Amino acid sequence: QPEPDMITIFIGTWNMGNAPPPKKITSWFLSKGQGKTRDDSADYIPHDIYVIGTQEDPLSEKEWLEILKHSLQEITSVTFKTVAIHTLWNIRIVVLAKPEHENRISHICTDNVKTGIANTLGNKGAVGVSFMFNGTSLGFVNSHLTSGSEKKLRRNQNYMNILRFLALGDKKLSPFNITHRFTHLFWFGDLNYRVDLPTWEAETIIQKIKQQQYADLLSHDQLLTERREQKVFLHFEEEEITFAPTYRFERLTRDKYAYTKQKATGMKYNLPSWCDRVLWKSYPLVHVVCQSYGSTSDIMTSDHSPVFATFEAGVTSQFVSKNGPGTVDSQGQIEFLRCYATLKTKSQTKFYLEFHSSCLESFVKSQEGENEEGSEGELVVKFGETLPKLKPIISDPEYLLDQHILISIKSSDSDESYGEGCIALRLEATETQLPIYTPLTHHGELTGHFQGEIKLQTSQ
Ligand SMILES: COc1cccc(C(=O)Nc2ccccc2F)c1
């Protein structure tokens, strides 16, 4: 029974509005409704993994698990296994997998982050799950960010707190936050970004939605504009939105957007918005393709509609050779030529690199680089031909070309990371000097760049 090189992953996000679900929610898991929808010919084909994020979820874990499992069994005739479930307040994540994957999944981690302080601590935050699927690390974050049209900067702060403090994946990757720990990271939820148009334009917006003319609304979506200005979700992807705003609906129909200010809303307007989103970040040159992104039309218990997204994702096998794991394979090596980091810092410490990868027995520290002044007032840290030659555990090109090297640039004075990035070993050639590049981030914000050349030797 061969190991897969691709799986499909379902991501759902639904703010349930503190109401129980209706009796049938199968349209969610079938990717049916509005937007990029899934072909009917696929309806009986199970996804490999289903990841369900809820917000304002009034159910117990038991109650929701029974609904989810019975839903999937009705669609697919497969009894899914529970990988993980984690709840913070009314924010919940469930991961389900096909039974054949049970002995492919390991290293399951869960965590949560509470956002805000005093007044604003007690209902917003995030839950997440990570695990290994054979040779591939997968991370999932469901966040409920701060509400309100005039709080986009609070949402951006909530995002940075969540990616700093959510503790998932391999704890040995100590310089790296969740935006670097996984082959594939999916981040979804009620992100609560709004369409920033004047309150007076509400009925005009409703008109546009009825005409399925979303362009002049999406051009004011706060998440798209904040991402374009590099204020949040740097280096994440989102499929194009082709479904109507998923908030704020009158319950029990989808015919009416309920936008006007009410005591129940704190006298705030809720113009129709794409609150409910799915984004992802995968390591460079790993296969990931969005195959659906949309909202359901027939689940109407909440003031939000559920959102679905599905992905093809590349995965790798748990490789054994006669040498590694448990030793190096001296037929393999990774060399860095002519490498330099460009950093936005004002600091004048010396810096060194750490190279982290599951193709190494343990991380590798470099010598300190040579600091120079860049012509536009930047710090350039030169490593020259000084970088340590990396010794992978396995030399087989079928394994090595699928790997990645995480790089942290650290202060010699404080040992704190000033920037993190990732290099793919999926090269155009072996035994050949080839350009490499990554942006560097810290706390998910841009801090610099790392560039140079690589020379990869495999057994072939
Ligand atoms: C379906 O694949 C796997 C693979 C490895 C471990 C598990 C697992 O431990 N599941 C579980 C057990 C008790 C409580 C909650 C759970 F989610 C599941």
From Swiss-Prot:
What's the PTM story here?
Tyrosine phosphorylated by the members of the SRC family after exposure to a diverse array of extracellular stimuli such as cytokines, growth factors, antibodies, chemokines, integrin ligands and hypertonic and oxidative stress. Phosphorylated upon IgG receptor FCGR2B-binding.
A Gene Ontology cellular-component term:
cytoskeleton
Q: Does the keyword Cell membrane belong to this entry? A: yes
Does the keyword section mention Repeat? yes
Q: What does this protein do?
A: Phosphatidylinositol (PtdIns) phosphatase that specifically hydrolyzes the 5-phosphate of phosphatidylinositol-3,4,5-trisphosphate (PtdIns(3,4,5)P3) to produce PtdIns(3,4)P2, thereby negatively regulating the PI3K (phosphoinositide 3-kinase) pathways. Able also to hydrolyzes the 5-phosphate of phosphatidylinositol-4,5-bisphosphate (PtdIns(4,5)P3) and inositol 1,3,4,5-tetrakisphosphate. Acts as a negative regulator of B-cell antigen receptor signaling.
Question: What does the annotation say about its assembly with partners?
Answer: Interacts with tyrosine phosphorylated form of SHC1. Interacts with tyrosine phosphorylated form of DOK1. Interacts with tyrosine phosphorylated form of DOK3. Interacts with tyrosine phosphorylated form of SLAMF1/CD150. Interacts with PTPN11 in response to IL-3. Interacts with receptor EPOR. Interacts with receptors MS4A2/FCER1B and FCER1G. Interacts with receptors FCGR2B and FCGR3. Interacts with receptor FCGR2A, leading to regulate gene expression during the phagocytic process. Interacts with GRB2. Interacts with PLCG1. Interacts with tyrosine kinases SRC and TEC. Interacts with c-Met/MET.
Query: Which protein is depicted?
Result: Phosphatidylinositol 3,4,5-trisphosphate 5-phosphatase 1
